[PDB]
Amino acid sequence: KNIDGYFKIYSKHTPINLVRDLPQGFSALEPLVDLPIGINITRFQTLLA
C-alpha cells in the first residue's frame, strides 16, 4: 500500500501443500522493511525468471 508516499513492506513465510489454487485459511503478516520515500506510485509489475 502507499499512504502519502510512506511505502511499507509486509511479508509472511509459511509452508503449504496444494497444487493450483490458494489455501482458504487464515494467516497474518509481519512488516519487514519500512521505506519512507515520499513518491507517488500508480503502476507496478511482477518480476519473473
Partner 1 sequence: FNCYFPLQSYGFQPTNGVGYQPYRVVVLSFELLHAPATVCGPKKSTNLV
Question: Rounded to the nearest whole angstrom, what is the least distance from the CB of residue 11 to partner 1 in the complex?
Answer: 22
Q: Is 5 among the residues that bind partner 1 (CB under 8 A)?
A: yes
Minimum CB distance to partner 1 smaller for 21 or for 34: 34
Cα 8 from Cα 1, distance rounded (Å):
7
Q: Residue 30: which of 10, 15, 14 has the closest Cα?
A: 10
CA-CA-CA-CA dihedral for 28, 34, 35, 40, to nearest 10: 40
Please tell me whether residue 31 binds partner 1 under the rule CB under 8 A: no
Query: Does residue number 38 form part of the binding site for partner 1 (CB under 8 A)?
Result: yes
Q: Which residues bind partner 1 (CB under 8 A)?
A: 5-6, 36-38
